């Protein structure tokens, strides 16, 4: 993918909003880019609720490294579009703007697709209760005195 850094995601979001692009004649101040990177980091931290939210492979930059822009986001190829569409939606209010309906629909669809695989992986059935017998059909379990399921 050509989008390999956090700043690349920021530029993609700004191009989506029409605020700035590599084709326009006026580009935003680098402070605006830093603010957008901060918004992206906050959003990603909010999504990734310390491992109990949306898993994306995003790499959170540290304070020791000076430039937040320039580090690889670490996202997979299938996650970039959703991330930068949601970023455009989130940073639209900064410029007294409002993301168009297509951007909002794409952001919703991308977030759903982002969480689809994790939701599939988290649909796990609980084990048998501790008060449930194994049954006489399980000859191996019954010969070894395992009459009831362990549980937990």
């Amino acid at each position: 993918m050509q989008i390999k850094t956090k700043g690349d995601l920021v530029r993609a979001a700004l191009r989506k909003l029409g605020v700035a692009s590599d084709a326009t004649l006026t580009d935003v101040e680098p402070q605006s880019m830093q603010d957008a990177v901060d918004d992206l980091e906050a959003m990603m931290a909010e999504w990734y609720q310390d491992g109990k939210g949306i898993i994306t492979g995003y790499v959170f930059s540290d304070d020791e490294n000076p430039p937040a822009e320039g580090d690889d986001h670490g996202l997979r190829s299938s996650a970039v579009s959703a991330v930068f569409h949601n970023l455009a939606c989130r940073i639209a209010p900064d410029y007294a703007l409002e993301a168009t309906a297509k951007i909002i629909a794409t952001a919703k669809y991308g977030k759903e697709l982002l969480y689809k695989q994790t939701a599939i992986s988290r649909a796990k059935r609980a084990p048998y209760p501790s008060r449930m017998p194994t049954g006489s059909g399980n000859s191996f379990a019954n010969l070894n005195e395992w009459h009831y399921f362990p549980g937990e």
Binding site: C89, K108, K111, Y115, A119
Partner: protein, 88 residues
């Protein structure tokens, strides 16, 4: 055929959007460690999650045709498998 209905048929479970139960998936796995079930309510793009009554997969059912035909065939064999009235 009826046996095939009993084994190879999805059973009655709720229909959920993945975002409705995001973060509460351990509440629905079948344990009894909670007093209720929690559902997600808000969406950052749509404001609020749409409202739709919970839908459950229908329980497997033996068709009226299958039961009627099983009874009819059993009755037919019962009536026709009578030698005489006795084996005189």
């Amino acid at each position: 055929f009826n046996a095939d209905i009993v084994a190879r048929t999805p059973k009655k479970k709720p229909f959920f959007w993945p975002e409705q139960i995001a973060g509460f998936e351990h509440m629905y796995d079948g344990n009894d460690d909670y007093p209720y079930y929690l559902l997600n309510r808000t969406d950052e793009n749509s404001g609020d999650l749409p409202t739709q009554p919970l839908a459950y997969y229908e329980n497997p059912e033996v068709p009226q045709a299958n039961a009627y035909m099983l009874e009819a065939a059993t009755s037919a064999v019962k009536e026709v498998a009578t030698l005489g009235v006795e084996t005189y």
